[PDB]
Design a protein around this nucleic acid. Structure first.
Length: 298
DNA sequence: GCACGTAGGGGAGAATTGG
RNA sequence: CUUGCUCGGUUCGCCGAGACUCCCCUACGUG
DNA sequence: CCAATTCT
């Protein structure tokens, strides 16, 4: 399942003010300060409505309005599974230390001498019982089924300056021709460049790509982001993920490029089929402002 | 101290069911 | 092959050659 | 209609 990455275009509130992330941060801060004995008593978390309403009331951890079961089994299963990772990290190395004790022992009966002194075992919990190398907060907002990207609709989805594309209509194939533009119009190829163009089928960049305008010592092209950041919005492909009262609109063009260069899909594909080649569980990065889609088994 | 290999733990659904 | 990114050419209009398994966290070396 | 359920 190779990755695929898309850019966020709209955002009701930042991803750090989201109850899905506010709860997630609160859950693991409470957990990462447990002793090896408090975790066992507090590690009886179910995958049900009643159990999660028991865990979130017995263990104090506040809920900011988040009571979605499918979005609380990606927070309470990841947190405790990373918790055991630190102890496992210790005892997958200490195991090799007690395998090292085997290594020194094996030669020892051959010599016949009594076994030599060996290193002791090092735990992962400090003197107070709290974990020594306490994990850090994962900022990733993992998505669940009932909230998956869907095509943007101007009617039902909230009013937003954009253009909506019907699933039924196949996604258009941009800049089909290259040299058919008259002089001056953004996209015009000068006549001298027309000889010695590519005879091979490669990715085609559009005139407002940053790679075409990136500053470098040999370039004298003026960068004005009041134009290269407005032409792209009209031609964008919006897909929306709506958690509660909060909605993210992304740019599906990052998925359209992926299928093209990997041979999965041709020029004529619907938005449904484009979104149907990927998992319905994006991964979000609040700091970068990016969403990471994944493929399927085929 | 920014920077870097590195090493090593974790993570990256979706088909039925029921009010 | 419409976004993003890297190394280049340009009459400055956009053209050539590419990369694509990524993210989080905690450790230990290099000056 | 759409959350909660059970399995890899």
């Amino acid at each position: 399942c190779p990755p695929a990455k898309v850019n966020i275009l709209a955002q009701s509130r930042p991803l750090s003010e989201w109850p899905i992330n506010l709860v997630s941060k609160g859950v693991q801060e409470y957990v990462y300060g447990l002793t090896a004995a408090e975790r066992e008593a507090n590690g009886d978390f179910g995958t049900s409505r009643k159990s999660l309403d028991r865990w979130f009331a017995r263990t104090g951890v506040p809920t900011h309005g988040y009571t979605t079961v499918q979005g609380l089994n990606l927070i309470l299963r990841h947190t405790f599974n990373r918790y055991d990772g630190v102890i496992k990290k210790v005892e997958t190395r200490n195991e090799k230390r007690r395998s090292k004790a085997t290594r020194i022992n094996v030669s020892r009966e051959a010599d016949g001498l009594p076994p030599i002194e060996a290193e002791p075992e090092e735990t992962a919990f400090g003197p107070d019982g709290k974990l020594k190398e306490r994990p850090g907060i994962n900022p990733s907002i993992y998505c669940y089924q009932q909230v998956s990207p869907v095509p943007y609709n101007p009617a039902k989805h909230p009013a937003l300056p954009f253009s909506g594309v019907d699933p039924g209509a196949p996604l258009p194939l941009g800049t089909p021709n290259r040299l058919s533009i008259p002089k001056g119009q953004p996209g015009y190829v000068p006549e001298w460049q027309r000889p010695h163009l590519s005879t091979k089928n490669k990715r085609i960049r559009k005139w407002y790509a940053r790679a075409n305008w990136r500053r470098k010592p040999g370039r004298k092209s003026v960068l004005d982001e009041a134009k290269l950041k407005e032409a792209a919005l009209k031609e964008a492909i919006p897909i929306i993920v709506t958690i509660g009262k909060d909605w993210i609109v992304m740019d599906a063009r990052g998925l359209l490029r992926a299928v093209y260069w990997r041979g999965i899909a041709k020029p004529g594909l619907s938005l449904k089929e484009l979104l149907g080649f990927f998992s319905g569980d994006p991964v979000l990065d609040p700091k970068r402002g990016i969403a990471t889609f994944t493929f399927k088994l085929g």
